[PDB]
Design a protein around this ligand. Structure first.
Ligand SMILES: NC(=O)C1=CN([C@@H]2O[C@H](COP(=O)(O)OP(=O)(O)OC[C@H]3O[C@@H](n4cnc5c(N)ncnc54)[C@@H](OP(=O)(O)O)[C@@H]3O)[C@@H](O)[C@H]2O)C=CC1
Ligand SMILES: NC(=O)C1=CN([C@@H]2O[C@H](COP(=O)(O)OP(=O)(O)OC[C@H]3O[C@@H](n4cnc5c(N)ncnc54)[C@@H](OP(=O)(O)O)[C@@H]3O)[C@H](O)[C@@H]2O)C=CC1
Lengths: 311, 312
């Protein structure tokens, strides 16, 4: 018995659509937030800073009884060293084990899983915290997460207008050119968020790039970047003013610079909202701080492995 | 990007073969780990995911060591004992090695042999530092994977006039004595096994104390390898209370060692500290080395083998 290897291509083929991840993900998020009865054993992510290379190794193990899946995702991301750069990308790989045996069943690309699963979770949050009538969508960033998010948002919702802003203008244009559907390339984040109902922040910025003073009251913001406790994408007033929702409180309190450096108070976990124990103040300016959780990779890894296994 | 290389258990055995050769690089790693930040080792405490409905555990052990510039993560799975029903093997491990600068997963390799040898080597290091000044009788409690690896390196590293073994299941202690090279006295009770023993090795999956201080010869050195969970024990309160306690990692012991926690024993020092000389080795006193296993120990191993492998 040797572990099977699933290429990125083989994964894209058994996952195929991230909008299909929504249901199993809503379940996982709810189960994760329903404490022990939820069946998910997820310790907070551990990060190993590889300081001499300005990078980080993240390990995300999880067991979920509901679908009886035992996995662990390992990720590596290296700091932006400035605009002309040249940095190595986010890299992930997921390992799936036999829950009863402990045998390593498969090692698979985690890049597409990470792309698709993060976008799906943001979509779930948006479908819950998005305000009454919700016309304009704004995306800050133009990397892997930008595309995955755009893909599922245009599929799951209907925006009269979609905007994008990127520190490097040429990439925001490349984005608008390669994506299906029209997108307005903006030259400043304040122009991009001007009157925006839903905003998505997926950058590698360490200092605030979105200031609450530019945000339209009641807008929902998916804060996906800044997964270190000394990095920020949002301002103190945005963090101050808005009703804060996260995927995991323990994770936020350990990894979100935006939550920590601002001293904002966590209102609830997305899982709580999904199940109904916490209210969705979608009429108020909301912020969903996403850090990523092991169980989210578990449900995906599982789905894929079964699909793969079927042949 | 690169497709990760896969190293089978057999290929690991081929590129890694006398656990004795791991001793030097391991002493370095242990010293570096205990020399704080200057040591270059970034090792957060092991995280364990209990897989409750299967009575098992998933352990993740990531680490970066600048000295040898290696970035790895070992993933382990072990299931509580059940007797004959126990799953087989009880421990499964796999190590992943990454390119420290780009983050690319260079290789996924069997971790079973690494775990077996790495652990035995570390216990050997502790024993070589901690053992009484006339150490003649060796006693092993247990007869599984760790018992063999420990036996192998202890016989090669040290000179005992006598070696003893005790195992809950007598038939396996006998199978052990018959399979191993060199003579071993199979004992019918732990108390008989440790009677007058200078160095003791406990490598069982017991959750309740099996070794009581009352049977221990004053000055004996004990390598406490099992009971890696914070509600498992192998040693009793008297042994834990009267002995000078040494561990591999304080943070790890205070989080995972039931023996340390349930007894409320006070950690005297880290093995890394004594290796470097910052802490004393009270080898004339009854000592206990609580081993939990550390990621960096798998790091140095994984690296050594990956280099040998990509060479020839
Ligand atoms: N410190 C570290 O770096 C590491 C520690 N370990 C630990 O070392 C231990 C042994 O590992 P390994 O040899 O691979 O596992 P094995 O499955 O090979 O263990 C076999 C041993 O378990 C013993 N045993 C099980 N239950 C009991 C019991 N309740 N009381 C008396 N003895 C019992 C004996 O079982 P039986 O009666 O059926 O023969 C047998 O000798 C475990 O605690 C393991 O987690 C492992 C790796 C590293
Ligand atoms: N919530 C979660 O589960 C997850 C959160 N994350 C987070 O999402 C983010 C984006 O990830 P991903 O898209 O995969 O990574 P990418 O490498 O694809 O990020 C590209 C983006 O980084 C932006 N960026 C980089 N540096 C700066 C800067 N300092 N300030 C302004 N923007 C900058 C833009 O760079 P440029 O101008 O050079 O094009 C570009 O839009 C964070 O980096 C982070 O890892 C990631 C995965 C999951």
């Amino acid at each position: 018995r040797v572990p099977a290897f699933l290429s990125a291509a083989e994964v894209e083929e058994h996952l195929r659509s991230s909008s299909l991840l929504i249901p199993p993900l809503e379940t996982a998020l709810a189960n994760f937030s329903s404490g022990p009865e939820g069946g998910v054993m997820q310790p907070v992510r551990t990060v190993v800073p590889v300081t001499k290379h300005r990078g980080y190794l993240g390990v995300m193990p999880a067991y979920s009884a509901a679908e009886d899946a035992l996995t662990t995702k390992l990720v590596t991301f290296y700091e932006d060293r400035g605009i002309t750069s040249v940095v190595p990308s986010h890299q992930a790989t997921v390992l799936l084990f036999e829950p009863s045996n402990g045998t390593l069943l498969a090692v698979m690309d985690g890049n597409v899983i990470t792309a698709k699963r993060t976008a799906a979770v943001s979509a779930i949050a948006t479908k819950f915290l998005k305000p009454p009538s919700s016309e304009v969508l704004c995306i800050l960033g133009a990397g892997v997460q930008a595309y995955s998010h755009y893909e599922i948002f245009t599929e799951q919702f209907s925006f009269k207008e979609v905007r994008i802003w990127n520190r490097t203008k040429e990439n925001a244009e490349k984005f608008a050119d390669t994506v299906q559907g029209e997108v307005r390339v903006c030259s400043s984040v304040q122009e991009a968020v001007a009157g925006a109902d839903v905003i998505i922040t997926v950058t590698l910025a360490t200092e605030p790039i979105l200031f609450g003073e530019w945000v339209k009251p009641g807008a929902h913001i998916n804060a996906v970047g800044a997964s270190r406790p000394d990095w920020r994408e949002l301002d103190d007033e945005l963090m101050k003013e808005a009703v804060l929702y996260v995927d995991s409180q323990e994770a936020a309190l350990k990894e979100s610079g935006d939550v920590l450096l601002s001293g904002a108070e966590i209102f609830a976990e997305l899982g709580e909202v999904i199940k109904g124990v916490k209210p969705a103040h979608c009429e108020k300016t909301t912020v969903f701080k996403s850090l990523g959780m092991a169980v989210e990779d578990t449900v995906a890894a599982k789905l894929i492995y079964d699909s793969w296994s079927s042949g």
